[PDB]
Every structure is written in C-alpha cells, then in structure tokens.
Amino acid sequence: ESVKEFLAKAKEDFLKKWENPAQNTAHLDQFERIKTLGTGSYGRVMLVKHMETGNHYAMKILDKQKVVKLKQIEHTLNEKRILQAVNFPFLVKLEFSFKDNSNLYMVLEYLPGGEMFSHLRRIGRFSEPHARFYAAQIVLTFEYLHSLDLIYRDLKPENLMIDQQGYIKVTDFGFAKRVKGRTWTLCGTPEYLAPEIILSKGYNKAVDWWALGVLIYEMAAGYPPFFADQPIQIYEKIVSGKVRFPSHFSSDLKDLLRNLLQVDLTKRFGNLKNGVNDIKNHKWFATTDWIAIYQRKVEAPFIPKFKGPGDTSNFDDYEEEEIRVSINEKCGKEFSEF
Amino acid sequence: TTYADFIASGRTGRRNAIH
Ligand SMILES: Nc1nonc1-c1nc2ccccc2n1CC1CC1
C-alpha cells in the first residue's frame, strides 16, 4: 500500500518532466576533458571536470551523423527524454545535456568505483548474499521503471556502476522506451535477450524480468546461462528451453531462476497477476529487507577503494580521439527536441 | 568445466549491444 502511494507521487514527478523536458543546460566549453572511460556502440564516455564547480562527471558523446547512419535517432531521443525525467536511488543521474553542430552530449554523475562487470570478471563470481544484494536493487529499479510504463531493455553487468557506498547505479538508457502496449524492436545484448525478442514477437516489460534471471545467474555462477563464441549459437541456446545450473547454486536460487528464465510468458515471474510480488516474496529473498535496501541502510558486501573523485584506476585505457565540432550544423531537424 | 569453457570463449570481454 505504501509502495502504491510512493509510486503514484513518483509518476506525478516523472510526467511533469516527461511532458516538458530540460534542454541545453550546459556547453562543451564549461568542461575540461580528462580521459576516455569507454567506447562502444553507445559512442564514447569521457571523464570531464566541470570548471565552475570542480565536480567530475562522465560525459557520453554521440556523433549525430553516426546516430543517423545507425538508425538510432528515436532511441537517442528516448534515452535523453527518459533520463532527464527519472529520479530513483539506483539510477545514474543526468546532470546536464546539450548539443553542438556535430555531437550530442549527456553529462552524468561519475562513479569512480567502475562497472560491476570489471569486478565480477576479476573476482570470478559473487556469493549468493552478495549477488542477492545487487539483485534486490535491480528488482526495486524495475518496479519503479515499469510503473512509469518504461522498459529498460539493456540489463547487463557492463551497465551497472558501483557507487562509493557499494550500491549500484543503472546507466545506459540507450534502448529505454516508454510504451503502454507491446513493442517489436530487436535490441539488447545477445546473452540477455528473452526468447520472444529473438523470435521477432511483440514483447513487453517481461523481457526485463528474463534479463534479471540472466544477471542473477551470471553474478552467482561467474558466467552467463547461455554463452558461445557467436550470437547465433547463443540464440539457439536461449530458445531451446534448457538451462544448466552449477552444483553450488542453492535450491531457492535454482527455483527463482527457473521462474525468471521461463520461456512461457503466462508462467514467467514478474509477468503474473501478482506482478513484482512473486519475485519479492520468493524464498531466495526471505532475508531481504526491501525498505532497508531502498533507504541504503544495508551494509554493502563490497566497497571500491576510494582513490579520489577523478581517479580512473577502475577503468581500462582507450585511444584518445579528438572531439571534433564542425563549422556547419549537422542533422538539425532530426535532433531538434534534444 | 563450464568456467574453463567460458574463459576460453571469445565473449569474456565487454559485450556490445545489438540492434
Ligand atoms: N556514469 C558513469 N560514471 O563512470 N562511467 C559511467 C558510465 N556512464 C555510461 C553511460 C552509458 C554507457 C556507459 C557508461 N558508463 C561506463 C563507462 C565505461 C564507459
């Protein structure tokens, strides 16, 4: 009942910003370029210093011409529109957004603790209580996002940052979409795709619950439930209706994962009449105090070593490329609302 | 072991999104 009340007020706040988005809140000249944190299909993320405050931020840079070539215009507009409107403890904050002749810029809070991905690969795997701690934060985040009619569509350890208190922040809203009915875009990461996406069906928020099953399995095993050298071989594994669990997985963990990694939509947890409560009330989460997680009162199982607000030791090294700004405006009409 | 199979695979690094 308090969840319904909290979400009702959360929806009112969201809808005001969704209907009247913040636009052009900074300029490139207000930032000092420090280091490239990463490059991917998401363009590039740069560590920057905001000169007026001395604050460090992670600046996502997208080339307008490349977005157009990749047919990602609508997805990029969704990303910025959604990010500027949301407000949740486990979501990365969009601090500023702007564009120039060549690029789009999204300035986000910087998490020097780095991606869950890097820590997970290095350590190998997380114990069940450690994995449960992160999984509970995802459960609350999807409960929040789904109540706003938002589908996330890109859950993976690469998209989960570890904050200075050991809690997570979901980043990368590149495929996030506000949709009341079903949708059809083939998007996401091969290992995390629900069978309904692979089989070109209309799908809904249940794909995020399947992706949660893949994440929990990956955190607890150290490898994903479906892996192979090529995406096609991964797709065949996903649709086969077969999953194998390590012998160290508890009975409760296996039961929860068979209900999340469920090919049948009428049977998938998160998608039934009781919605998110089928997950929250599962035996694997019996020790989880949901309010205490939300309030960040639970002691985190792992805290990244603090080496300063601008330290990059948790990120890999990338070739440093220029930020070129053409003298001519590119794709003006396409990115008018950004 | 499955761990050894994963480690020897080409997909242990950061995975790119598809569209
Ligand atoms: N916030 C962030 N604070 O440090 N890194 C952040 C981050 N924000 C992102 C938004 C989109 C995609 C990747 C992102 N990363 C991870 C970097 C390795 C690329």
Side-chain angles (χ1 to χ4, degrees), chain A residues 2-3 6-8 10-15 17-40 42-51 53-70 72-92 94-164 166-272 274-282 284-296 298 300-304 306 308-318 320 322-332 334-338, chain B residues 1-18:
Chain A
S2 200
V3 174
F6 173 92
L7 295 167
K11 192 140 191 167
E12 191 180 9
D13 296 347
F14 172 86
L15 292 172
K17 295 171 172 179
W18 168 262
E19 288 303 327
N20 190 24
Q23 192 165 11
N24 190 46
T25 59
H27 186 286
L28 188 59
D29 299 353
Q30 296 171 338
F31 305 90
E32 168 191 5
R33 177 216 173 119
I34 313 292
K35 199 180 194 290
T36 299
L37 301 168
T39 66
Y42 61 78
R44 70 191 146 147
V45 179
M46 290 226 64
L47 173 65
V48 300
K49 193 167 185 172
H50 190 238
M51 281 117 71
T53 64
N55 294 327
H56 280 92
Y57 295 108
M59 189 190 271
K60 187 172 171 164
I61 314 169
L62 304 81
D63 181 309
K64 289 189 274 174
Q65 293 181 135
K66 292 178 183 199
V67 170
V68 168
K69 281 190 180 290
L70 289 169
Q72 295 304 299
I73 302 159
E74 204 63 44
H75 285 156
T76 296
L77 295 176
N78 285 342
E79 177 178 17
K80 182 251 160 176
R81 195 175 177 186
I82 295 164
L83 258 178
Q84 64 80 47
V86 293
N87 173 36
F88 202 66
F90 318 118
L91 293 176
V92 77
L94 177 67
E95 302 286 3
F96 308 101
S97 75
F98 53 95
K99 66 199 181 213
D100 58 30
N101 282 351
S102 299
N103 307 310
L104 312 166
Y105 305 89
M106 284 176 246
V107 180
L108 308 156
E109 55 173 312
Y110 179 54
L111 291 317
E115 309 147 87
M116 176 193 289
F117 176 87
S118 64
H119 299 278
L120 176 56
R121 290 290 181 275
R122 185 183 66 254
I123 296 152
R125 63 170 178 99
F126 299 149
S127 61
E128 290 193 30
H130 189 165
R132 179 187 295 122
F133 174 80
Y134 298 143
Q137 294 170 63
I138 304 303
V139 174
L140 291 171
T141 304
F142 285 173
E143 180 170 30
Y144 168 82
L145 295 175
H146 295 174
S147 75
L148 301 178
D149 309 297
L150 304 165
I151 316 182
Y152 179 62
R153 304 197 292 186
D154 202 24
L155 184 73
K156 54 184 179 188
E158 294 88 317
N159 286 351
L160 308 175
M161 302 307 293
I162 305 172
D163 75 27
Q164 301 87 333
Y167 280 74
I168 58 186
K169 288 191 192 287
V170 176
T171 70
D172 209 348
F173 269 67
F175 298 121
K177 183 182 173 92
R178 193 166 183 245
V179 47
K180 269 175 194 141
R182 68 190 109 192
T183 204
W184 298 272
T185 310
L186 166 63
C187 65
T189 300
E191 285 86 342
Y192 286 77
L193 303 180
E196 61 264 36
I197 305 173
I198 297 157
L199 302 173
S200 208
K201 291 177 181 183
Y203 61 84
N204 65 10
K205 67 188 178 73
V207 305
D208 279 339
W209 296 121
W210 169 283
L212 175 67
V214 183
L215 183 76
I216 295 168
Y217 183 117
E218 192 178 323
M219 294 188 292
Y223 51 79
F226 318 104
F227 73 84
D229 284 316
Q230 299 304 320
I232 192 69
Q233 306 168 312
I234 299 162
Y235 304 151
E236 294 163 3
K237 284 180 188 195
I238 294 170
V239 310
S240 76
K242 302 191 286 170
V243 185
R244 297 189 65 84
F245 306 103
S247 55
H248 66 77
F249 274 24
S250 65
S251 289
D252 300 329
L253 179 54
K254 292 188 280 195
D255 188 78
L256 172 67
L257 298 172
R258 289 183 194 105
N259 291 299
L260 293 172
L261 299 173
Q262 173 52 262
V263 176
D264 193 324
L265 287 165
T266 72
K267 300 181 178 187
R268 193 183 309 157
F269 266 28
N271 203 47
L272 323 180
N274 297 331
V276 72
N277 295 318
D278 284 335
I279 296 156
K280 297 210 265 183
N281 300 332
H282 192 275
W284 196 67
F285 287 113
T287 61
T288 310
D289 193 327
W290 300 93
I291 189 66
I293 292 286
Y294 172 79
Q295 289 172 343
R296 300 191 245 218
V298 179
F302 169 66
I303 285 162
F306 182 79
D311 177 72
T312 59
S313 72
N314 290 310
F315 296 87
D316 283 335
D317 299 326
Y318 299 85
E320 294 297 336
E322 72 170 323
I323 298 159
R324 215 192 59 92
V325 183
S326 174
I327 57 164
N328 306 282
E329 194 194 43
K330 309 292 172 75
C331 319
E334 296 94 319
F335 300 102
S336 192
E337 87 168 48
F338 192 99
Chain B
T1 67
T2 313
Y3 166 79
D5 292 334
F6 179 63
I7 293 303
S9 82
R11 293 180 72 89
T12 69
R14 289 173 184 81
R15 302 152 290 198
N16 294 306
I18 59 87

